[PDB]
């Protein structure tokens, strides 16, 4: 449930784990 990240879930906009 990724409602607190909108938009395109890029890898370079979502670092670490995860």
């Amino acid at each position: 449930g990724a409602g607190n990240q909108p938009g395109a879930n890029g890898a370079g906009n979502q670092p670490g784990a995860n």
Partner: antibody
Amino acid sequence: QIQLVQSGPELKKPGETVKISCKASGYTFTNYGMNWVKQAPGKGLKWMGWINSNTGEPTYAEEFKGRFAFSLETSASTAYLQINNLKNEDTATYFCARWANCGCAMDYWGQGTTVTVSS
Amino acid sequence: DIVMTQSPSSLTVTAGEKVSMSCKSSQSLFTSGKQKNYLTWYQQKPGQPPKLLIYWASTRNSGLPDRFTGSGSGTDFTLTISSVQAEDLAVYYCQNDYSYPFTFGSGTKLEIKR
């Protein structure tokens, strides 16, 4: 090319405001977030934070909440670092660095903007 | 949050010797899902921004010669140069890339004796 070109050096009297630009070129700007790294003169690296180029959301480390601001202009592929209420602690060289394609390292780096705070 | 204790501060080697340097983290950096360590080694040649050398604790970057090799897992990690050249004098920094804040290490300075 793939280049992060950063603004020129600044001298500012204490308590003033500085704003550094980091113009990115050669890649899809909204798919790689932007990091800011402070390096004091003669000292090591310190991770300030990162702004999500896709959602707009900044993330500041605990030593940089409150006086520091990350912002974006997507239509010009530019990230901004604004330091308000300058202190002599803030005299440093500031780097922008984009997160790599993995999301696990900082791929490309700006040249560095040197900010001197002095009366 | 994570403390990156890096060692030694400086080390001085003849050109051609083998060089090892340690980076130890106060928490584990292994994810257990993607099955890889989130640790990065950077090179800062003097007067320059940091250059990316090694991500995922062992994977060298696109262009890097093979003498730079990264080892270690979980807590203890190690950057190794197998034959130092005269242009390898720089300061080498390890970075936590596991969780916020993505803290750096104090850095190891590499000096050549001749």
